[PDB]
Design an enzyme around this catalytic site. Structure first.
Site, PDB file in Angstrom:
ATOM      1  N   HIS A 113     -24.082  38.179   5.772  1.00  0.00           N
ATOM      2  CA  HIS A 113     -22.873  38.399   4.982  1.00  0.00           C
ATOM      3  C   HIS A 113     -22.260  37.034   4.647  1.00  0.00           C
ATOM      4  CE1 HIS A 113     -18.565  40.095   4.603  1.00  0.00           C
ATOM      5  NE2 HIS A 113     -19.287  40.798   3.701  1.00  0.00           N
ATOM      6  N   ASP A 135     -14.598  40.812   4.563  1.00  0.00           N
ATOM      7  CA  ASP A 135     -14.372  42.196   4.093  1.00  0.00           C
ATOM      8  C   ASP A 135     -13.032  42.837   4.494  1.00  0.00           C
ATOM      9  OD1 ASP A 135     -16.855  42.157   2.591  1.00  0.00           O
ATOM     10  OD2 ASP A 135     -17.971  43.200   3.858  1.00  0.00           O
ATOM     11  N   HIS A 140     -13.129  48.180   0.262  1.00  0.00           N
ATOM     12  CA  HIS A 140     -12.907  46.909   0.957  1.00  0.00           C
ATOM     13  C   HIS A 140     -13.073  45.690   0.022  1.00  0.00           C
ATOM     14  CE1 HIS A 140     -17.375  46.735   1.402  1.00  0.00           C
ATOM     15  NE2 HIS A 140     -17.449  47.476   2.520  1.00  0.00           N
ATOM     16  N   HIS A 150     -14.189  42.257  -0.813  1.00  0.00           N
ATOM     17  CA  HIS A 150     -15.136  41.238  -0.348  1.00  0.00           C
ATOM     18  C   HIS A 150     -14.826  39.890  -1.002  1.00  0.00           C
ATOM     19  CE1 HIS A 150     -19.302  39.696   0.760  1.00  0.00           C
ATOM     20  NE2 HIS A 150     -19.090  39.087  -0.413  1.00  0.00           N
TER      21      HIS A 150
HETATM   22 ZN   LIG Z   1     -18.613  42.167   2.478  1.00  0.00          ZN
END
Ligand SMILES: [Zn+2]
Length: 145
Positions: free
Chosen positions: A29, A33, A110, A112
């Protein structure tokens, strides 16, 4: 009436910068988030200008921003709506978009946030955590709750 109280636990972050699981097949990642209610406005962390605006089949809507020194970039995945166009100057705390469950198959929304240097792509990403650590309102410099 009487019963309304929250099933709260911990902070709003789902995942920070790093690998998804053990073994080399579940990769990194490259962002942060923030879990948000659908339609929450996303605010600019810093003053900057918009570079690119596009919509991805699995990441949802995407806003790209550049910082005032011209080397740092800022991605914003899982948007419902934009509040800026390509080539708009922005100032810290101003609304730039609204987050929504775009790209996501069934789950709630969410934001990001992905922070990059010298260009934009997975390899260009640095770490968003130490950047939010110095913001005027911290993570609340990125969203309106
Ligand atoms: Zn993310």
């Amino acid at each position: 009436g009487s019963k309304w109280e929250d099933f709260f636990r911990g902070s709003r972050i789902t995942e920070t910068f790093g690998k998804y699981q053990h073994s080399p097949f579940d990769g990194k990642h490259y962002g942060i988030d923030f879990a948000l209610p659908k339609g929450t406005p996303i605010k600019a962390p810093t003053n900057g200008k918009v570079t690119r605006i596009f919509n991805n089949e699995l990441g949802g809507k995407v806003l790209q921003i550049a910082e005032d020194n011209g080397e740092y970039h800022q991605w914003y995945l899982h948007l419902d709506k934009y509040n800026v166009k390509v080539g708009d100057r922005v100032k810290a705390g101003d609304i730039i978009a609204y987050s929504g469950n775009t790209g996501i198959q069934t789950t709630g929304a969410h934001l990001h946030f992905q922070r990059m240097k010298g260009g934009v792509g997975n390899a260009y990403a640095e770490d968003p955590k130490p950047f939010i650590d110095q913001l005027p309102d911290g993570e609340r410099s990125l969203y309106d709750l």
